[PDB]
Amino acid sequence: GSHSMRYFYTSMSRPGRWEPRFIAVGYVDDTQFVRFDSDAASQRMEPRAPWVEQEGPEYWDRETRNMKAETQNAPVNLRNLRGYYNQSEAGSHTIQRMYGCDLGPDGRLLRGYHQSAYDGKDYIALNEDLRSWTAADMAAQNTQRKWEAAGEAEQHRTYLEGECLEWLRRYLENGKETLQRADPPKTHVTHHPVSDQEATLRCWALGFYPAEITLTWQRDGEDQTQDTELVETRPAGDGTFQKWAAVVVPSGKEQRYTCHVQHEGLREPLTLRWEP
């Protein structure tokens, strides 16, 4: 289907006097593969997946250079935006950056990204045409003015259409046996009494990959939308994910409810009920 490579940059200023901090993380689909932390001792881009570990010293040398360059720019970036917003040089702030490529079934660039945030709000973002910017306010337009003069719009399109894409394919081939394998979810159902007229039915989905999944409770062939409590999909800690869906139902009539589990690791959607 569709694959993706993503990077997540976080730039934090932090008075009183601590030097600003820069953290970077890289993902292929739902799998992290690299890490950097200006606070860590290493001072290099470290592998967080087996299939990148098998990479030359020259690779990690460049990756490290970039991280250090990002780390040196961080203070100035934070200092710049602090100026656009007339903010005091006494408070803490954050600049986040997300970029990467989506690889379509055709093997060409499906979609590209380069968007930044200031203190959790959209700041500036590359449009889908990869040729123009969208600034959130007159402050971000200060940045836009800069990136336009340097022709940053292109030269990120070039990266997204080339490197992002060739290396994504590379990672995908080397980690093929896992990255392109779908682990189907292990499922079961639990039951807890709420009161005398009601009870809770919980549908479990464990150890699945990728994270994309769909849990729904049904009665009379109908979805119990606003009665179903879907918890955010969470990491198991071993690389896979977990999720459940609960619905409050009248006691006794438990059997009129069936849970429907959908995952790309299953041939037919999974169907189960409570088994006392």
Binding site: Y7, N66, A69, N73, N77, L81, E152, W167
Partner: peptide
């Protein structure tokens, strides 16, 4: 892999 440091904000 990674993208160059680019231009400052």
């Amino acid at each position: 892999y990674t993208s160059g440091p680019g231009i400052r904000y």
